[PDB]
Amino acid sequence: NLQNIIYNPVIPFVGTIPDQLDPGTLIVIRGHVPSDADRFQVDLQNGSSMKPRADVAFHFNPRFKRAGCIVCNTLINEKWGREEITYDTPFKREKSFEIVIMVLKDKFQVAVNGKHTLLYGHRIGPEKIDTLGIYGKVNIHSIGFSFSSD
Amino acid sequence: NNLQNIIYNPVIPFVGTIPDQLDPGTLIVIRGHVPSDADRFQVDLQNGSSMKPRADVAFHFNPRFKRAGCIVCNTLINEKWGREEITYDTPFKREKSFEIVIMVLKDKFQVAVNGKHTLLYGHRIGPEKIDTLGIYGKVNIHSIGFSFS
Ligand SMILES: OC[C@H]1O[C@@H](O[C@H]2[C@H](O)[C@@H](O)[C@H](O)O[C@@H]2CO)[C@H](O)[C@@H](O)[C@H]1O
């Protein structure tokens, strides 16, 4: 059911999501971490404004320093909320990945390389998300959606 | 019989509490028969048993028998149905017995009937929210049991 919106995008990438993130929607992102990455992020946004910065419903932020971790959070009206830090991370420098974000009624579920990684409860209604951004030190092969509606 | 909380010949419609969480690898095993004149039946994995307002249905597994037959799968959230996922390759038949095995995975249900893979259904509600098994419609149930993880 997977409809890619882009292949091999320049980073940072900001694109419109062409349908609503209804429960059962999948987001699939394939890419590769450069050898000298410190971090990258996948942001599910309400719009693409820079000034002031668009709300980030779901900020998914792998960080590579020390033992590595993933930080998840939400940006509302240019303020970050409570960090949810996952210390069990599958990402590594100079390694390829496939991220699958499953949109559920109450939360996102993320799996990497076919293995569950983390959950993150909705803080912004997922119906408000219309934009996906990818930022930081990462190579992206593809970004696709499997919409519930299709 | 390694199954757990086995019930025979429940009264239909059946609404029962699932006796443990639907963790990955959990099985729900339902043996029964399709009446000769069935239109449809359903197996519903529900968040509670409220009738009004109607409990959320994480997984509605709905064999339909008109025309060439099919299985409709869907989810009910806050009393509204989502987009149907229709399986046209259906193993069910009027007057035929079945054994349904629902395997719960972290990201989907995997359903087999009489030992044959039937369909996949990706989660729309987290399966940890499911505490209730409903069986409704034109169907005969011989047994229900579970294999937990
Ligand atoms: O919360 C996501 C957000 O983190 C910012 O950095 C935080 C940092 O994670 C924390 O350990 C420190 O105590 O506060 C910092 C200031 O906000 C990042 O700057 C931002 O890009 C997001 O990743």
Ligand SMILES: OC[C@H]1O[C@@H](O[C@H]2[C@H](O)[C@@H](O)[C@H](O)O[C@@H]2CO)[C@H](O)[C@@H](O)[C@H]1O
């Ligand atoms: O989707 C499950 C749901 O279907 C309802 O019937 C649908 C029907 O399948 C569809 O063809 C039509 O467009 O809308 C009907 C109402 O949503 C059933 O009423 C319900 O019991 C479930 O089986």
Ligand SMILES: [Cl-]
């Ligand atoms: Cl940021």
Ligand SMILES: [Cl-]
């Ligand atoms: Cl949920």
Ligand SMILES: [Cl-]
């Ligand atoms: Cl119904």
